[PDB]
From a paper:
Here we report a structural and functional analysis for an epimerase, [name], that primes KSM biosynthesis rather than the previously proposed [name]/H, which instead acts as an acetyltransferase, inactivating KSM. Our biochemical and biophysical analysis determined that [name] converts [name]-GlcNAc to [name]-ManNAc as the initial step in the biosynthetic pathway. To better understand the catalytic mechanism of [name], we solved crystal structures of [name] for the wild type (WT) and its complexes with [name] or [name]-Glc in resolutions of 2.44 Å, 2.58 Å, and 2.09 Å, respectively.
Despite this, the structures, not least the one with [name]-Glc, are still in a position to provide a structural basis to help elucidate the mechanism of the epimerization reaction mediated by [name]. The hexose moiety is held in place by a group of highly conserved residues for its recognition and epimerization, except for Arg12, which differs from the corresponding residues in other homologs pointing away from the uracil O2 atom (4.6 Å); the guanidino group of Arg309, which is associated with Glu291 (2.9 Å), is in close proximity to the C2 hydroxyl group (4.1 Å), and the terminal carboxyl group of Asp97 is in close proximity to the C2 atom (3.8 Å). The C3 hydroxyl group of the hexose moiety is also within hydrogen-bonding distances to both the guanidino group of Arg309 (2.7 Å/2.9 Å) and the carboxyl group of Glu119 (3.3 Å). The C4 hydroxyl group is interacting with both Lys17 and Gln95 through hydrogen bonding (3.5 Å and 3.1 Å, respectively). The C6 hydroxyl group is likewise interacting with the carboxyl and amino groups of Asp97 through hydrogen bonding (2.5 Å and 2.8 Å, respectively). Q95 was found interacting with the C4-OH of [name]-Glc in contrast to the histidine (H) counterpart in homologous 2-epimerases, which is at a distance from C4-OH of 4.5 Å. Despite the fact that [name] exists as dimers in solution as well as asymmetric units, only one [name]-Glc molecule is bound to one protomer of the dimer.
Author numbering:
A (entry chain G): -1 to 39, 44 to 63, 67 to 185, 190 to 346, 351 to 374
B (entry chain C): -1 to 38, 45 to 63, 67 to 183, 192 to 374
C (entry chain D): -1 to 39, 45 to 64, 66 to 183, 192 to 374
D (entry chain H): -1 to 39, 44 to 63, 67 to 374
């Protein structure tokens, strides 16, 4: 019956759910807080695995203006009905931005989980890069995964007292599933060098993804003992490009999206990871897996500077060369093996929330 | 199978539900009547065993809300074959529902009729709501002789006014672990504060008075169940959340709230209902307003106005904790302000006399 | 360019328009004020007095009271805010007057009530007009009472004396402003003017009144009646089916206000259930027989200007006979010199009350 | 038939229309550009005076979330239908924010007129202070009125090449009406002010409604009682609550002329005749010093710190004793008066801001390497 700080948790996507799950679990266990989940949008599967129970699903997530209009227009009512005291948004989504704005309209304070990631390339990608900069102005409190991300927030006028370097909750999430099976994946990878590849970014759809698929095909032809596992993003155009280039190759296992527990176990077994995923750039180095990044830019410069990760873009010759170097030269491999925190990020977020909103002078 | 007088019961809020619950229970138990509940709260419904036949999901601009109730309440009143409609208190629901009932020529009774400050449109719209309901209602259940006098001054005929007392006393009587652990062996002040006209700075001054009293009196405790509004929660939380002597609470179930009030040494409130409940438990009340609709407790010395002046609140709480003669002067037995706890039965007999009789 | 008090004027019916017209004209002429008309429902009355509505809400019509009141409460706020209304005036006893007063109160726009304090003392009779007056009375900051009796009714409902002004009735102002087939029909004959519209008298009671007209016509070959019919098909049908063959009765369409007042001036007496005609007819020295069991104009009853006759055909025949046959009974129902309902300066008295309340500082 | 850069101009209010009008006129006159006006929201009167012709009026206007939702949802269609290339928004309005976002959603680049004004008080006022910081992240180009405002933009991570110190277009707007004596005349205002010391007062901010405005009105009443020769002209913001507070405190005082909103030409002429100006208006803080009129600011904070630092303006809040004292000092002591008009500093620009905006637009969007 003691007053709990009621913390709104608003997300629409898998990566948001994975990164918020450890914060939800910490808020649930602590008697000083009550998490209240509102979804805007694979997700049931993540909710089941971590035991997340949404109070409300807005069935909103299509033109960007129409989607943002609906969230700005409609999120206020459930936030008020659920007596939310403070709202947490995560990452770079149009949900995170529109929900932060909707919360601000009701004078509900906002906290941003995973604050301060920047490429320095204006509107690239769109709208994610501008979403971060808008959320940054709306948020009272910022949970930065790294010192570099905290620096980016100060350069946009955020006061140092509003910034906590908590590390990234994705490390917490990884640790939760590492201390907890898939027959077909085990049978396919057992006793083989397996490359794990994920690729989903809209700016790479069609021809650039086709080049990456051609690089995979070439590596498979040249290296009969090499295997690839490619869990496919749930978009029909992404599935069609990989399927049409690779479905006949016995050395490639094209997969449905994997449950996070199975995905992390697979990543642990992989010899290296090719990805355009932000989260996988954080997860893979933590498991000592070299990462080749299928983009021209990254929001994770820490991995680049430490030699954990290299940019490879969608150039098939460079991908073939760089994967070859790592498989053939054990010194190049070892040169690519904490950037993103220790796995206590949820507890550091909780203590920042308690200090800001459960304290009086 | 004998004809029952079907009594519409319309409310949208906790205070209405608490005050109507004893009337609903009396109507349910009496074979001459059938209560029909329409809402415009689940926890209060569960506690008293109230089962709404219809929930209109209406409760935003005042004009839009009143428009919806006037427009939409008629259909469920007609569908449920309501004979007579009861509304309670001062809400825009009570006013708009009384009007919607009048439009269908359904006679209206007003529970807790005739409370006045004498300050026009203060608060708005509650003060005007009472005066509009007063003209719409055929029958008025006044809690006190003073309230009956206010009805006569607005042209209500004496035969349409019954001094029933307040059903909140009935409600208290019906309901009579972390809270126990926090209060056991300590002087505990119970504080509630919710009025829109006190939001922000005035509530901040009251919270500062609490902080000062806590610093000066290490043995003093406060329990503050917070009104479910984020701005109210924010002011108390930001002023008091670090003070070990203050337990900030979620809204309490009515049974738990009344038990806490019984254990408290005194009550600070801007609540109308708590001004009626606290004196009935012999707890001195300091009223966190510049006006009250409960002048009876003021006149009898049960209650004193303190407003949102932190110096006056500190002084007045100090007087009661330090001077046992000042304390006893606010509990003197013998004078009954708000009724005996038989208000539901007196309402039922007024309903039977008016609408279950023939000349 | 000096600030004007912007006065909302809200009405939906002929009687409201007639009684508000002199106040609108006074507000228009005075530089301290700007009238803003919003209608809920009349072109003919607007043309005659030069009233120009800024907004017509197309709300009124066969419609439920709750649906109409819901629409006015819901929708009148927007034009009141858009037109920057400072204060709102409503008139009389209509559901428009009540719902508009409430809509204005919701936007914290102060309300004034023109023709405040009329009471029968019969609860919900008629419905909803009697309750509308008592609701408007609680909502209004300022009350323009036509008579001392009406002011007394307001004090008995808890209104402070400082909020009540005895202005008289603006219908006298309206009459004074307006002061061929009808001429051809009435020339050389004693003509009774009859109007009857009240919903509580529809069907059988109106049929009894029509039978009384028929009986008077049969017994008095020289007597004529002119009956302008309220625009309701049921009212038209009852009079038409009882009287359309009688050469002594002219059933009429509603008359323009100027023509109606001229006809009333020519009439020997008036039979009506109209509130306004009970005020207009005595001012022209015409005895009034009131086709109701109650009146909100007790002043005319007490002064002998008017008598209640209800819908009893024997009583109507008797009372009309007495007035036509006995010039002493006729003269007893005329009081030239003395005024029941005001002097025809009610608009100016309203304006000065508005200036005192809302265009003054301590 | 040569391609013009089609520049969307979106506003809903008088202050926006006044500050955008000189940019619209410069875009209209230059053959390289075509202004396209879309309104969201007194305004006809400003449109007539400057010859602004809106292509679309949205009639949106109420809860902030509902209004912002409607602009984000519905402004895209007219922007696309009118083939807008670039969008300009002005100031701190929820229209400016929601329109900038709606433009960004259609990949229409945004320029912000009057960029970089800051109090340093988070969410004060709400939502204007956050609107500026959101527009700042959305806009590709920023027209800062002062070097101080440009400094505030760089501290929020704006690249120097995206910030131009143009000055404030309100000075351009003033200059456009100063040249028009015939249109600036008003019989009743002339009769009231001719041969008298006249104080001009405007006050509209929501955070001052009710009690604070009442204190300001009491200060006016006290100054009037103490100084029988003093006059006040108070054009009232079109809000019934604002009108009621001034009317109920001042309507009987022959020394106070309460007015309907004045046409901008007449308002600037009145300000030129006034001995001093009391205001919570942003624009009047910029206009008054340009006419050499000391300004007392009826707020606890300002986004025009330049006028405070240069001694052109002083914060007076809504404290009636301080207002009476400060107005008294300026009327009674010609040295105190002259200290608030000292020459040697131009705070808000020279009245060439529209031309500097145009040249920034051409360099950014009408150039190839
Ligand atoms: O079959 C799969 C594939 C991936 N993952 C997990 O999914 C996450 C990443 O999902 P993805 O859709 O690839 O999104 P990201 O690109 O990682 O995330 C973007 O969106 C996030 C939310 O806005 C931001 O935090 C990031 O910075 C941004 O890169 C990682 O934790 C993976 O382990 C699975 O569980 N199963
Ligand atoms: O944590 C809490 C706090 C209060 N209460 C009860 O809630 C009621 C008071 O509710 P509150 O929201 O404070 O409203 P009031 O101020 O009491 O009531 C207003 O509204 C009522 C309905 O219109 C009117 O009868 C009153 O005169 C008017 O003051 C009382 O019965 C309390 O015992 C609880 O059960 N739990
Ligand atoms: O052909 C006709 C008949 C009547 N009238 C005039 O119409 C008005 C009366 O209209 P009516 O429809 O009879 O309404 P009333 O019964 O007079 O008015 C009711 O409605 C008004 C507004 O609510 C209240 O002021 C009254 O007290 C109430 O009785 C009077 O001024 C008449 O002179 C005409 O102009 N032409
Ligand atoms: O009767 C009058 C009174 C004022 N004005 C003019 O109106 C403008 C002021 O408008 P106002 O409504 O007082 O708004 P401001 O407070 O000046 O403007 C706010 O809103 C603008 C748009 O977001 C921002 O540029 C400003 O920083 C912000 O302070 C000025 O140019 C005045 O000269 C008139 O034309 N007539
Ligand atoms: Na918890
Ligand atoms: Na029963
Ligand atoms: Na006028
Ligand atoms: Na041009």
């Amino acid at each position: 019956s003691h007053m709990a700080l009621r913390v709104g948790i608003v997300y629409g996507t898998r990566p948001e759910a994975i990164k918020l799950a450890p914060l939800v679990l910490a808020l649930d266990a602590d008697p000083g807080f009550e998490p209240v989940i509102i979804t805007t949008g694979m997700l049931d599967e993540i909710n089941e695995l971590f035991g997340l129970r949404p109070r409300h699903n807005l069935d909103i997530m299509q033109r960007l203006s129409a989607m943002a209009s609906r969230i700005v227009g409609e999120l206020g009512d459930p936030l008020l009905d659920e007596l939310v005291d403070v709202a947490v948004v995560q990452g770079d989504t149009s949900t995170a931005f529109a929900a932060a704005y909707a919360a601000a309209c009701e004078r509900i304070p906002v906290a941003h989980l995973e604050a301060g990631l920047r490429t320095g390339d204006r509107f690239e990608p769109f709208p994610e890069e501008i979403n971060r900069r808008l959320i940054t102005q709306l948020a009272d409190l910022h949970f930065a995964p790294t010192a570099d991300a905290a620096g980016n927030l100060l350069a946009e006028g955020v006061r140092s007292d509003d910034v906590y370097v908590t590390g990234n909750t994705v490390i917490d999430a990884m640790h939760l599933v590492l201390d907890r099976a898939n027959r077909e994946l085990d049978a396919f990878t057992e006793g083989r060098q397996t490359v794990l590849l994920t690729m989903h970014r809209r700016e790479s759809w069609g021809i650039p993804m086709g080049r990456v698929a051609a690089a995979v095909a070439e590596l498979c032809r040249s290296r009969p003992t090499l295997r690839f596992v490619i869990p496919l993003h749930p978009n029909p155009e992404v599935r069609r490009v990989f399927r049409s280039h690779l479905s006949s190759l016995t050395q490639v296992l094209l997969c449905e999206p994997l449950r996070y527990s199975e995905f992390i176990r697979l990543m642990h077994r992989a010899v290296l990871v090719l990805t355009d995923s932000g989260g996988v750039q954080e997860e893979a180095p933590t498991l000592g897996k070299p990462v080749l990044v299928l983009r021209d830019r990254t929001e994770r410069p820490e991995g680049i500077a430490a030699g954990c990760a290299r940019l490879v873009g969608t150039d098939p010759a460079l991908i073939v060369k760089e994967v070859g170097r790592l498989l053939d030269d054990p010194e190049a491999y070892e040169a690519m093996r904490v950037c993103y925190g220790e796995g206590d990020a949820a507890a550091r977020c909780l203590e920042a929330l308690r200090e800001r909103w459960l304290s009086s002078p």
